[PDB]
Design a protein around this ligand. Structure first.
Ligand code: DO3
Ligand code: DO3
Ligand code: GD
Length: 128
C-alpha cells in the first residue's frame, strides 16, 4: 500500500506514535517518506546481507526473521514479510521497540539526515 501523508499520519496517531518517546508525529511521517516513500512494500538490501522492510525500513539484522540473515536476531518476534502489510500495526509495534533501545530515531538514517533539526510539523500540516 502507498499511503497518503494525512492517511499515514492518522494511522500512526491511532497506533500511539504521536509523542512516543518524545517524538512528535511529524518526525514519524518524515521518516516514513524518506525511508519508503510511504510504500509498505519497500525492501532494500544492506551490504552485510540484511534487508530493510516496510514503511519504516526495519532491519532483519536485529528486528525480524526473513530466513536469510544468518546469526541475526528477531527482537520484534515477527516474519519480516509482516512488515510489508497494508496494515502498519506490526511496523508501528516494532518501531516502538527500536526507538526505545537507547538510540531514539537516529536508528533511521533518513530521519537523522533529512528530518532531524527541521520543521517536522510541516509533514502533518493540513491533516485533520
Ligand atoms: C498537492 C500537489 O502538490 C500534488 N502534486 C502536484 C504537483 N506538485 C506541485 C507542488 O508540490 O507544489 C509538483 C510536484 N511535486 C513536488 C512535491 O510535492 O515535492 C511532486 C509530486 N507530488 C507529491 C505530493 O505533493 O505529495 C504530487 C503532485
Ligand atoms: C512542492 C511542495 O511539496 C513543497 N514542499 C514544502 C511544502 N509541502 C507541501 C506538501 O507536501 O503538501 C509541505 C511539507 N512536505 C510534506 C510532504 O512533502 O509530504 C514536506 C517537505 N517537502 C518535501 C517534498 O515535497 O518532497 C518540501 C517541499
Ligand atoms: Gd512537500
Amino acid at each position: 500500500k502507498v499511503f497518503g501523508r494525512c492517511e499515514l499520519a492518522a494511522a500512526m496517531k491511532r497506533h500511539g506514535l504521536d509523542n512516543y518517546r518524545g517524538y512528535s508525529l511529524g518526525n514519524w511521517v518524515c521518516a516514513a517518506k524518506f525511508e519508503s516513500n510511504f510504500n509498505t512494500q519497500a525492501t532494500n538490501r544492506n551490504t552485510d546481507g540484511s534487508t530493510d522492510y516496510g514503511i519504516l525500513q526495519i532491519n532483519s539484522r536485529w528486528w525480524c526473521n526473513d530466513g536469510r540473515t544468518p546469526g541475526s536476531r528477531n527482537l520484534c518476534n515477527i516474519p519480516c514479510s509482516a512488515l510489508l502489510s497494508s496494515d502498519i500495526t506490526a511496523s508501528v509495534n516494532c518501531a516502538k521497540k527500536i526507538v526505545s533501545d537507547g538510540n531514539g530515531m537516529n536508528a533511521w538514517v533518513a530521519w537523522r539526515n533529512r528530518c532531524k533539526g527541521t520543521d517536522v510539523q510541516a509533514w502533518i500540516r493540513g491533516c485533520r
